[PDB]
Amino acid sequence: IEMKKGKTFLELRDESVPLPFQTYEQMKDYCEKFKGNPRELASKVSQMQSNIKLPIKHYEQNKFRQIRLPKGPMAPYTHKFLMEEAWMFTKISDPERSRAGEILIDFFKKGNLSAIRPKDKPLQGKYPIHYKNLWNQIKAAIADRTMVINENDHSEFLGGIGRASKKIPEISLTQDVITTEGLKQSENKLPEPRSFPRWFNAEWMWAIKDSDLTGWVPMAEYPPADNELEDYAEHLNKTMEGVLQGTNCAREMGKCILTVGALMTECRLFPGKIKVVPIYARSKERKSMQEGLPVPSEMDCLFGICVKSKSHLNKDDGMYTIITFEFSIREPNLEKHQKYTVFEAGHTTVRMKKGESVIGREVPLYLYCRTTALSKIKNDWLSKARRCFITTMDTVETICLRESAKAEENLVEKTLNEKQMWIGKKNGELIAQPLREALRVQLVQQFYFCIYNDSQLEGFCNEQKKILMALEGDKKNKSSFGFNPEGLLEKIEECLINNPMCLFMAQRLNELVIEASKRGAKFFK
Amino acid sequence: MEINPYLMFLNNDVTSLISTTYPYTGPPPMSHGSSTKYTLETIKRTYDYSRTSVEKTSKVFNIPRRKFCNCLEDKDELVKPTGNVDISSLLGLAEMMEKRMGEGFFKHCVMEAETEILKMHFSRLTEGRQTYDWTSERNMPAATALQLTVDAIKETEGPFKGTTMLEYCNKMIEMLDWKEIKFKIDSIKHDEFLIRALTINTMAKDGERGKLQRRAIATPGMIVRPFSKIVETVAQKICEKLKESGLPVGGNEKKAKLKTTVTSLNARMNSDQFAVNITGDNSKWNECQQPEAYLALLAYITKDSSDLMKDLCSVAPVLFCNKFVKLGQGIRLSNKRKTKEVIIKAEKMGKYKNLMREEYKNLFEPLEKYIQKDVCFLPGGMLMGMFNMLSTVLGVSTLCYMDEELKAKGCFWTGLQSSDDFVLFAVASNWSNIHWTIRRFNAVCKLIGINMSLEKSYGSLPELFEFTSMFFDGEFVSNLAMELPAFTTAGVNEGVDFTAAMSIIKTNMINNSLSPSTALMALRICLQEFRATYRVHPWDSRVKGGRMKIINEFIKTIENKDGLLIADGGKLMNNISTLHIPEEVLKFEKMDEQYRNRVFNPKNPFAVVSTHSFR
Amino acid sequence: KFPIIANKRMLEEAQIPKEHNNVALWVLASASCINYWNFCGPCVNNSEVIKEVYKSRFGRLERRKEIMWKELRFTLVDPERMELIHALGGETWIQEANTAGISNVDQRKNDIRAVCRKVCLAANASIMNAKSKLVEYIKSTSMRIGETERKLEELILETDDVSPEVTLCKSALGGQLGKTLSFGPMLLKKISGSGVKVKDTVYIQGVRAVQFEYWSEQEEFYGEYKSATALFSRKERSLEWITIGGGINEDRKRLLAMCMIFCRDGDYFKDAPATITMADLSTKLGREIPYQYVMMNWIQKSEDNLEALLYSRGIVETNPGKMGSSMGIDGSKRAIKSLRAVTIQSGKIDMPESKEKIHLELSDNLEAFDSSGRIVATILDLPSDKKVTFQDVSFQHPDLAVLRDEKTAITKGYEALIKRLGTGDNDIPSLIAKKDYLSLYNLPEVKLMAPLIRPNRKGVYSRVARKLVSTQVTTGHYSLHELIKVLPFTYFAPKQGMFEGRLFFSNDSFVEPGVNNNVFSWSKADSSKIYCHGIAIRVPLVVGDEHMDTSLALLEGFSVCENDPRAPMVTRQDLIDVGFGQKVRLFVGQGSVRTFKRT
């Protein structure tokens, strides 16, 4: 028994070999009899070490430097939906009509949508007429009880603005044709660099606040318990959920979830067709106007509408297109809102408590129009936004066990209610809050990571780790040493373009090293 | 007011908050693609890291063959990557490692791998991420291409009745010499079939934590698959006995290895000496590994063993010394206004080179020599995520080095190495000899292509180092390799997906990457994901779905709602202490006997084998 | 649509019709077919075969069911279980669940030490009767210790387990000691030397001053903190030298800081931190505190204080040959730089033993003294009060336990409401049959429960509750459960306002009609029971229909009616503007909708 040999294989084997050897047999004999001569090897490694100039820095004599950010216009809003400038009409939830096609029709019946009649001239936009005619067609379709749109003139345009052209077979090609058409290799465009955003902090703060309504995110049930471990775990999970669910970030999470759950089905059952889809969410409880305590109130909310183009999700890496018509009661700013076309759609009403009664105060109303694309992978990634809770949970438990182990006793409530964590600076002075209040910041960080996820963010997060470890070593009086910091600075500066999250994180990281310079000796000013 | 979610790093550690820096695990929405330009840049950097210029036209293709091994030139600026290997030093390191572990070590390992292979069925090859068909010229799972190959063999020259790995390999060998080969219908000649077998395609999939540097992960065919499996089996049998080998497994065992290493160090180094750490990160671990050195190493290994293994292990190396690479989708043209756009393949880009831009041109002409129709005759490198065990063995060989020049100075080193990431521990008695030791180590590493990064490799005093996302410290070893399932992509069956997810969560808990509350949250999340996947809900809920209409109609005939299945308006009963236990085993005695027997009825038209399968 | 494949004869033999209710089910088939098959299909008896085949899994389940779960504890590191090691013990936590072994001694030690801590703390409520209240608590505290119902007047002596509380409570009994000490959680001991007390001052904010005491002579001791031995010598308010035997990063830091405080070495005994000036309160509610315990407490607040204290101790650069025995700021075993007068090593320092027993004298602050001062224990070295459930215990004397909480108050109120029934005249059923509800708004028990009500909006709660009560009484349709649930609110004048659907107590809890809740729950088929935080209570009566009529216990001026989807969903506010003969749907709970009609 043996591996019966061919011919071509043997020829290759005798061919593909090291330089001095031209046959497998010579190389084999040299190998099977290779002996050790550590002296020549030592001389060789010393020669290599001599002809190499390996620098070794200690971060103390040659410290780091502040990062040089790009320069130019501010980075605009990028996410698909609106977080802080949003607005929503409300109504009671019927379990017999708990579907988008039904919720939208019901919202439309009372005739509050039909009153939305944007005027011709916008404030800032590009193709207002298309958006306006499309809005009229949407209302018409909803009136017809079918979410479909037959005519394909505007959608076709707005979907083809990205790319649309003819195609000539290579076989039908000559040199004279080329010289006539001036054909060339399609130049590839690069993302333009942008400046630091001056609105991220506001959105973060707004998200930290507590919403009036609560129960945006649905969750599963809690199985039985059989010992103290599962009881403690259940207690901790319930506490954290009760703390977060009443946050404005949860609202956006639930909205994304319920809208993607419908888009992923529309791109599946009505591909190649134009459909209409709402941007809605469902609540389960509020806070009394006379008392700051929770109260059961199941309700539905509609922030806007999202139209769908032809989507097959099997070609062009499954890229498809949509169009958003969102509601707002806050006039825009030119920088943050660049991709948005805006209108003024009549007025609306606001409701607030008045003693033992409710009143209504009319305000204007705006309509935010925008176009954007998506894919199947982005859908699978957004639908799984509940995982953000898992990440936040880990951070909490990390803090709530380590301490509990140092003292050897349950310190969960004590640390949650007492342990102070720096969150920011006010009036040139630090700000601290309990862990129970910093959970919100952690969750918002994870969420924003989930939204602006991209290669740039991957590089930023993979690189900042080294700076963090170097800083930690500095704290504990350890002579951190490196090889080429400036190269790392360049690696990090090259991945900073048209992604506000990375820019904000870089600025805050510079601020961090600045503040730590008061206690560290590895950073410039 | 302002915000800075890093100020919590001042009065706290990093091992407790570092997780907040990276997003949650899952499929990357980046869509890292495998274009032609990226592949060409890769090939260029490969040929360049070869610091030589020699060639030798072959006789099977009439093509040059850049022989970048044992022919080092262009010594200038050698801190940058290199690929020219020295065989003498390689065999010397292998000899050192053998001496350390023992004499009949390699022999014992190769014997074990052999005996394991003998009783192996070729069907094993069906277990693989993906491959590249040599008939349809596409990428598919292993089973599909295997069926294609076997039925083509049947159609052309009768069936394959071996039913074993060895007969399969010998059949492949024989097929290398067949002049005509058929397949469903069409046939081909010898040269084309050879090429197809030596073809490779660049896959875009790159899914993992840390870094998705696998833009152009390889996707070989089926001919070379079994030999690669054999070599990997041997390299694995070897890496097990090595203390500094964290590849085959991770977690508990990994922490054990870490602490064993550290304690042995503390108990070995003399009082005068003081240690240090380095967070190494090998760069271009795929564009500097050459199969020729692997071949010489395998030869030196099997030198004293059955010639069977000597010849067998020498198959995949040569198959990688000659590997045609499938260039991705060809470039496209366009007029000024972009109203017209032409599309051309790669094979014809050499026909319109006068039009492409410079950066794309200067990257194409020097390689036109090696092109045949649409591919590039890459004579070396190692792009696949293969031979990881073998590369790890080579690294461990690098670490087991020691001579008298060091001993005289009272210094040494040690550490641990993954595939392309490692951690070093130097020892000395002066704040300068440490630098000399580091430079010596870098030199010995560069002698054989193993390079190191400078913008991603740092160091610090002994207490703080990082390895495979496991940020070690004086204590509080923190992991970050939290995995999760995915139903939509892998819908194996309704019955088996939840139990598999429970087992996965249990495992993650074992590796300490998960905690009780975190595990419970993940469970309550995966349950909802499952339900939404198979479009199922409980009975209490007021849903109106297609399965739900009939499920809501048939709910009033039962009382043991607890015993109901999740797939059938059920509720959860498992918990942390009941993961290894499937819900079925947990509800058997509780399910109303009627429903029970109605489910476990083997007289049905279709892990506990349920009447819930999706054939 | 029908991706799932199936068999054909297997389908017809089971008579599976397609589109049973517009569900095709199907060779191919859908998934709903599986539901139709498992809900209405053939019946087999193969349970035994399944169990036999899956014996390994079902034996694992049996084993799991064969467990006696125990407590868990957070801590660190200084086959049948491998199937569960994931859930048995991690690295920061661990559970002592056992299988067959039983021995109840160390748990008994924990219980006795906990209760001793408890009682010794309870005695810290006066200024003069310390010893008296203490001893009387002891004599009034008995326990079912282990299996024997023993008292807590002999266990403290029979036991041999050094501790601050054991000693602090046994000295009053004239019990024997072991020459051991307790400076906070740390454990100390003397080796050689001796001295005398001496006084000195220390400033706060740079202006004030406070007196502390120390020793001026040389004296060596043996420190011992969790997972860490040590040896050192104190001389004239300063630490001369010290050596540590067993290494743990966190433990070595706290032990060193505690020994430094014991030696009062450092400048923070000359001046004080700017954090102390925030308080300058070396005092309890009405008692005094030394400077050492204040400093310690300041350490417990944050590790930054520990780092500052350690920086106060001189830091220098280690010289060759000493790295192996050097130290770092974070306890690092070896480092280029270390602290002055330090020595690290491996192996725990063998602790000496003293075979000489003595008795001490308690003071006003219960501080014990053996001789030449040399305090051995005190309350100052104890943790803060930690509530823990005590079982197998009897505690009779006042101050035993407050045993008064809003939850228990509500429980007792409801128990009284239930007992009042009493199946007799001048009780709930007689007033019901008589239709005299006004008297219900004047009972004593409701008056006792009134203080537990949210005061700001109690009028509206009372209004609604009286509405429900009268509407259920007059008509004769009622349900004792919901009545008793809402009664405690029918005791204050009714007023106008906005109601939401919940009745809130003063502890931020609440109750809601027509639904169940932890505080109050009940269900049919067990109507003789009323749960209160899971505590099942009994009804002195029996009913089969008095509760079945709840059509008026949900809303005030409405009554349930037959379901009708056409009726529109509404809220609790617009209800006022409804008419008659106008049905309306409305949520009565979580995903629970019901139809209602006026009157």
Swiss-Prot record, chain A:
Position of motif Nuclear localization signal 2 (NLS2)?
A: 1-46
Could you say which residues of the full protein are shown? 183 to 707 of 709
Per the entry, the cofactor note is: Binds 2 manganese ions per subunit.
Question: Its function?
Answer: Plays an essential role in viral RNA transcription and replication by forming the heterotrimeric polymerase complex together with PB1 and PB2 subunits. The complex transcribes viral mRNAs by using a unique mechanism called cap-snatching. It consists in the hijacking and cleavage of host capped pre-mRNAs. These short capped RNAs are then used as primers for viral mRNAs. The PB2 subunit is responsible for the binding of the 5' cap of cellular pre-mRNAs which are subsequently cleaved after 10-13 nucleotides by the PA subunit that carries the endonuclease activity.
User: Lineage of the native species?
Assistant: Viruses, Riboviria, Orthornavirae, Negarnaviricota, Polyploviricotina
Does this entry carry the keyword Transmembrane helix?
no
Cellular component, GO, one term:
host cell nucleus
Coding gene? PA
| Protein name, UniProt field | Polymerase acidic protein
The EC number on file is: 3.1.-.-
Self-association state and partner proteins as the record states: Influenza RNA polymerase is composed of three subunits: PB1, PB2 and PA. Interacts (via C-terminus) with PB1 (via N-terminus).
Protein localization? Host cytoplasm; Host nucleus
From Swiss-Prot, chain B:
GO biological process entries: DNA-templated transcription; symbiont-mediated suppression of host gene expression; symbiont-mediated suppression of host mRNA transcription via inhibition of RNA polymerase II activity; viral RNA genome replication; viral transcription
Q: Which GO terms describe its molecular function?
A: nucleotide binding; RNA binding; RNA-directed RNA polymerase activity
Enzyme Commission number(s) of this protein: 2.7.7.48
Q: Which ranges of the sequence are coiled-coil? A: none
Record-linked Pfam families: Flu_PB1
* Keyword terms of this UniProt record: Eukaryotic host gene expression shutoff by virus, Eukaryotic host transcription shutoff by virus, Host cytoplasm, Host gene expression shutoff by virus, Host nucleus, Host-virus interaction, Inhibition of host RNA polymerase II by virus, Nucleotide-binding, Nucleotidyltransferase, Phosphoprotein, RNA-directed RNA polymerase, Transferase, Viral RNA replication, Viral transcription
UniProt PTM comment: Phosphorylated by host PRKCA.
Q: Where is the RdRp catalytic domain?
A: 262-458
Q: Which GO cellular component terms, listed alphabetically, does the Swiss-Prot or TrEMBL entry include?
A: host cell cytoplasm; host cell nucleus
* Xref: InterPro entries: RNA-dir_pol_NSvirus, RNA_pol_PB1_influenza
- Where does the record place it? Host nucleus; Host cytoplasm
Highest taxon of the source?
Viruses
Major place of residence: host cell
| Reactions catalysed according to its record | RNA(n) + a ribonucleoside 5'-triphosphate = RNA(n+1) + diphosphate
- What's this chain's function? RNA-dependent RNA polymerase which is responsible for replication and transcription of virus RNA segments. The transcription of viral mRNAs occurs by a unique mechanism called cap-snatching. 5' methylated caps of cellular mRNAs are cleaved after 10-13 nucleotides by PA. In turn, these short capped RNAs are used as primers by PB1 for transcription of viral mRNAs. During virus replication, PB1 initiates RNA synthesis and copy vRNA into complementary RNA (cRNA) which in turn serves as a template for the production of more vRNAs.
The similarity comment for this entry is:
Belongs to the influenza viruses polymerase PB1 family.
Per its record, how is this protein called by name?
Answer: RNA-directed RNA polymerase catalytic subunit
Annotated organism of origin: Influenza C virus (strain C/Johannesburg/1/1966)
From Swiss-Prot, chain C:
Q: Would I find Transmembrane among this entry's keywords? A: no
InterPro entries membership: Flu_PB2_2nd, Flu_PB2_6th, Flu_PB2_C, Flu_PB2_CAP-bd, Flu_PB2_middle, Flu_PB2_N, INV_PB2, PB2_helical
List the GO molecular function terms: RNA binding; RNA-directed RNA polymerase activity
Location(s) in or outside the cell: Virion; Host nucleus
Q: Would you kindly state one Gene Ontology biological process term found in this protein's UniProt entry?
A: symbiont-mediated suppression of host gene expression
The domain of life for this entry's organism is Viruses
Entry keywords, A to Z = Cap snatching, Eukaryotic host gene expression shutoff by virus, Eukaryotic host transcription shutoff by virus, Host gene expression shutoff by virus, Host nucleus, Host-virus interaction, Inhibition of host RNA polymerase II by virus, mRNA capping, mRNA processing, Viral transcription, Virion
Pfam families, per the entry: Flu_PB2_1st, Flu_PB2_2nd, Flu_PB2_3rd, Flu_PB2_4th, Flu_PB2_5th, Flu_PB2_6th, Flu_PB2_7th
A GO cellular-component term linked to this record? host cell nucleus
Functional summary from the UniProt entry: Plays an essential role in transcription initiation and cap-stealing mechanism, in which cellular capped pre-mRNAs are used to generate primers for viral transcription. Recognizes and binds a wide range of cap structures of target pre-RNAs which are subsequently cleaved after 10-13 nucleotides by the viral protein PA. Plays a role in the initiation of the viral genome replication and modulates the activity of the ribonucleoprotein (RNP) complex.
Recorded hits in HAMAP family, A to Z, give:
INV_PB2 (MF_04062)
Q: How does it assemble?
A: Influenza RNA polymerase is composed of three subunits: PB1, PB2 and PA. Interacts (via N-terminus) with PB1 (via C-terminus). Interacts with nucleoprotein NP (via N-terminus). Interacts with host ANP32A (via C-terminus); this interaction promotes viral RNA synthesis.
Family the entry assigns: Belongs to the influenza viruses PB2 family.
Protein name per Swiss-Prot or TrEMBL: Polymerase basic protein 2
| Protein's organism | Influenza C virus (strain C/Johannesburg/1/1966)
